Amino acid sequence: SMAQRKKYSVYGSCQAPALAKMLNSCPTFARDWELVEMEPCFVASEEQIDRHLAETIPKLDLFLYQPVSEGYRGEKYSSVFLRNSMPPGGNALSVQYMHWEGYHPTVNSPYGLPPHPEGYVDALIAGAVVMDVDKETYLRHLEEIGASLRIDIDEIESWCVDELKTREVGENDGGKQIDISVTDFILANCRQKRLFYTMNHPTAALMREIAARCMLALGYTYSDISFDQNLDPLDVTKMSLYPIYRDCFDFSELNRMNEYQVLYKKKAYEPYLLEQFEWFERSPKADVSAFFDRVAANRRWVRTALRRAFE
Ligand SMILES: *SCCNC(=O)CCNC(=O)[C@H](O)C(C)(C)COP(=O)(O)OP(=O)(O)OC[C@H]1O[C@@H](n2cnc3c(N)ncnc32)[C@H](O)[C@@H]1OP(=O)(O)O
Ligand SMILES: [Cl-]
Ligand SMILES: [Cl-]
Ligand SMILES: [Cl-]
Ligand SMILES: [Cl-]
């Protein structure tokens, strides 16, 4: 019934609690399923993950999860190890980890550098710092950078799709193919609808879409699927598209590059980008260079933009 709904959990990145929130907002889903919450992979403590292996997972009818490698934090947090503890007759369905750099091709997260309080940094700025390009020069060249990215938009999108398709194979989930994905949807809609606020924070529209695919995988009909349209669980931070590049997107509005939102606060694009320079200049140059090299290695358009703007 209702006090006798089946039990499910959602484990994975920050997208996992967001997906549970979205699913719970569908009355037909909520009629059948009761959430038992699991902390996501980046925050679960050892005590918490131990408890979930012992007490949560063996009681689930459904484990919706994103692939998480053993190398991330250890076996205990890995999707292979967690799903192994499911009871007989339980169902474990993998859900795509949604990552897409196509709106903000200059943005990534620190590797080998201190964590940034906002979680994201502009990697092209890191390259400029290494190249001894001054912050004022960079700010005067935003259009040249955006023009380069615009010329390269198809290459960028092709790579973004390939990264998702490669991950569908599930190497970080013991070689199990990902059950539930939205790759074709993302490519087909990305220029028409804003699908990501940051590379790994889907907007409401994308969260609804993936939640819908989960419901289809569970055997619900298309007509069963409806969500709270006001839910936008990953809206904390909103990266701004660069000038010129932004005009490739149907939704693009204000001010020659929009303000950023970071941790729910608005920040004008000029001070935001100047502060990125200041942040990188605090770290050892060798480490900033290692970071930029790591980002640029498989992202041709990044070095191309730096060269076209600053050579
Ligand atoms: S909801 C956003 C919360 N943020 C995070 O969890 C931090 C960023 N994500 C990750 O570190 C990983 O994606 C997690 C969730 C821990 C899973 O890690 P795995 O070891 O299982 O494997 P991944 O392939 O998911 O991650 C490895 C690196 O690859 C980046 N990444 C994932 N997906 C893509 C796509 N499609 N394109 C490019 N890069 C992608 C991850 O961010 C991660 O980056 P590193 O810089 O190597 O940490
Ligand atoms: Cl059971
Ligand atoms: Cl799809
Ligand atoms: Cl924008
Ligand atoms: Cl060229």
Numbering used by the authors: 1 to 311
Paper quotes:
The principal CPS of the human pathogen and Tier 1 select agent Burkholderia pseudomallei consists of a linear repeat of –­3)-­2-O-acetyl-6-deoxy-β-d-manno-heptopyranose-(1–. This CPS is critical to the virulence of this emerging pathogen and represents a key target for the development of novel therapeutics. wcbI is one of several genes in the CPS biosynthetic cluster whose deletion leads to significant attenuation of the pathogen; unlike most others, it has no homologues of known function and no detectable sequence similarity to any protein with an extant structure. The structure revealed that WcbI adopts a predominantly helical fold: the N-terminal 100 amino acids form a ligand-binding domain fold, with the remaining 210 amino acids adopting an entirely novel fold. Based on the structure and on biochemical and biophysical data, we propose that WcbI functions as an acetyltransferase and requires another functional module to carry out this function.
Here, the crystal structure of WcbI bound to its proposed product, coenzyme A, is reported at 1.38 Å resolution, solved using the halide-soak method with multiple anomalous dispersion. Analysis of early crystals of WcbI revealed that an unidentified ligand had been partially retained with the protein from expression in E. coli through the purification process. We therefore co-crystallized WcbI with acetyl-CoA. A second crystal was obtained co-crystallized with substrate acetyl-CoA, and high-resolution complex data were collected. The structure of the CoA complex of WcbI and the native structure were refined by PHENIX and CCP4, respectively, to resolutions of 1.38 and 1.56 Å, respectively. Co-crystallization with 200 µM acetyl-CoA led to almost complete occupancy of the ligand, with all CoA ligand atoms visible in the density. Although there is low occupancy of the acetyl group in the structure, the functional groups of acetyl-CoA form an extensive set of interactions with the protein, supporting the premise that this is a bona fide ligand of WcbI. Furthermore, the acetyl moiety is held in place through hydrogen bonds to Cys14 and His201, constraining its conformation and presenting the acetyl group in a suitable orientation for reaction. Soaks with acetyl-CoA reveal that the CoA head, and likely the acetyl group, are held between cysteine and histidine side chains from opposite sides of the cradle in a conformation suggestive for reaction. The two structures of WcbI presented here, obtained under different conditions, suggest that WcbI allows some flexibility in the CoA head group.
